């Protein structure tokens, strides 16, 4: 009884309009999530896609989460454990970039058993390609304010 999640996010500027797409599959069926923000970044949308998909889980699960985001992979596999040791601050004592979303992702995660699948390209990954199409459509017609976005 595993849940398969496929996520992607993108933006059209640095900061610009952006959006996310997430696909959840469980016991044969599929659910889709997508929303666009007026001023955000690619990395924030890559993170938001995973957050929204995991927050949709209403009971503890065994999850296989597939994403091609290098940023999410680096946070999960390289950075988050050390950021927690340092109180979510860098060496210059500033809050970690996108700390709001990393902390929200950590809350959305830790209740589930997650196997991360770090995919590279779209070839052979149709759900990831569709998640990208959803994110791009959302970026072309954004409705929400990414209140946590901060310059730099």
Curated annotation (Swiss-Prot):
The reaction(s) catalysed by this protein are: Endonucleolytic cleavage to 5'-phosphomonoester
Q: Where is the major localization of this protein?
A: cytoplasm
Q: Which GO terms describe its cellular component?
A: cytoplasm
Co-factor(s): Mg(2+)
EC assignment: the record states 3.1.26.4
Keyword Zinc-finger assigned to the entry: answer is no
- Sorted alphabetically, which CDD domains does this protein's record hold? RNase_HI_prokaryote_like
The record ties this protein, via Pfam families, to:
RNase_H
| Location(s) in or outside the cell | Cytoplasm
Q: Which UniProt keywords apply?
A: Cytoplasm, Endonuclease, Hydrolase, Magnesium, Metal-binding, Nuclease
Q: What's the domain of life for this entry?
A: Bacteria
Which positions in this protein are listed as binding Mg(2+) 1?
8, 46, 68
Q: Tell me which family the UniProt entry assigns to this protein.
A: Belongs to the RNase H family.
What is the name listed in the Swiss-Prot or TrEMBL entry for this protein? Ribonuclease HI
Gene name in the database record: rnhA
């Amino acid at each position: 009884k595993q849940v398969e999640i496929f996520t992607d996010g993108s933006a059209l500027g640095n900061p610009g309009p952006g959006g996310y797409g997430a696909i959840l599959r469980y016991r044969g069926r599929e659910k889709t999530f997508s929303a666009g923000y007026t001023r955000t970044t690619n990395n924030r949308m890559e993170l938001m896609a995973a957050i929204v998909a995991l927050e949709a889980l209403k009971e503890h699960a065994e999850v296989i989460l597939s994403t091609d985001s290098q940023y999410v992979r680096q946070g999960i596999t390289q950075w988050i454990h050390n950021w927690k040791k340092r109180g979510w601050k860098t060496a210059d004592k500033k809050p970690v970039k996108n700390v709001d979303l990393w902390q929200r992702l950590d809350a959305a995660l830790g209740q589930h058993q997650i196997k991360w699948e770090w995919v590279k390209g779209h070839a052979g990954h149709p759900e990831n390609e569709r998640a990208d199409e959803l994110a791009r459509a959302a970026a072309m017609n954004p409705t929400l304010e990414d209140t946590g976005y901060q310059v730099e």
